[PDB]
Amino acid sequence: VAQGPNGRALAESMNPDLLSAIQQHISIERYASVTYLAMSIWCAERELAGFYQFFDGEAKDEQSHAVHFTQYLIARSQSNDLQTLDAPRQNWDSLASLMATAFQMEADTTSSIQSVYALAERNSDTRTTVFLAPLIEAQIQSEDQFAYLLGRVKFANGDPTALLVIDNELRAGQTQRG
C-alpha cells in the first residue's frame, strides 16, 4: 500500500493541478466567509440587524464549507495548504450595492467549484466529480436565495421603510422564497 503526500494510505493518486485547484477553492470559500463577515459588520453599522444576523450566519456556513473541502483532501491522503487570506472589501454606498457584491461572491464560488469539476473530469478523477455534485446543488439554492434577497432589496428602491421591512424578514429567518 502506497502513502499519499499527506502521509496516509493512498487509495488513488491525484493530479497535482487538481490538488492545487482544490487548495485554491478552499481559499475562495475562506475569502467568501470573511467577505460575509465584512458585510455583516457593514449592516450592523447601519442598524440593519436582520441583515447583520443573516451575514453572520453566512460567514460561519461558508467557513464550514471550506473546512469540508479540507476534510476531502485528508480523505484523499493529499496535503492541505492553507494560504494567505486577502482582506475583504469593506465599503459600499448602499445595501443594494452590497447585495450585488454578495450575489457575485456566491456566483463566483460556484464558478470556482465548476472549474475544479471540469479539471477533475479531464483527469477522470471520479471521486472528485462525485464529491462536488452535492456542493454544486447547494450552490444553485444559494444562488436562488441571493438572487431573491438582492431582487427584493432592489425592489425596495432605496426606500428606508421597505428596507426596514426586509430587515425584519431576515431577522425572523425569512431568507428565501420558500
Q: Which of residues 48-87 bind a copy of itself (CB under 8 A)?
A: 49, 52-53, 56, 63, 67, 70-72, 74-77, 80-87
Secondary element (H or E) of residue 127: helix 126-156
Residue among 21, 28, 95, 113 that touches Cl ion (CB under 5 A)? 95
Residues 87-106 that bind a copy of itself (CB under 8 A): 87-88, 90, 100, 103-104, 106
Residue with cell 431582487: 151
* Alpha carbons 92 and 171: distance in angstroms, whole number: 21
Residues 35-74 that bind Cl ion (CB under 5 A): none
Task: Give which of 101, 130, 83, 82 is closest to 38, Cα–Cα.
Answer: 101
Buried b (16+ CB within 10 A) or exposed e, 89-117: eeebeebbebbbbbbebbeebbebbeebb
Q: Is 29 in the site for a copy of itself (CB under 8 A)?
A: no
* Alpha carbons 177 and 167: distance in angstroms, whole number: 15
Count of residues near a copy of itself by CB under 8 A: 86
C-alpha cell of residue 136: 454544486
Positive or negative: CA dihedral 147, 150, 156, 162: positive
State the minimum distance, in angstroms, from the CB of residue 94 to Cl ion: 4
Return the number of the residue (29 or 167) whose C-beta is nearest Cl ion.
Answer: 167
Q: Is 96 in the site for Cl ion (CB under 5 A)?
A: yes
State the minimum distance, in angstroms, from the CB of residue 161 to a copy of itself: 4
Return the number of the residue (59 or 95) whose C-beta is nearest Cl ion.
Answer: 95
Stretch that binds Cl ion, among 24-32, 50-58, 76-84, 93-101 (CB under 5 A): 93-101
Which residues contact Cl ion by CB under 5 A?
A: 94-96, 158
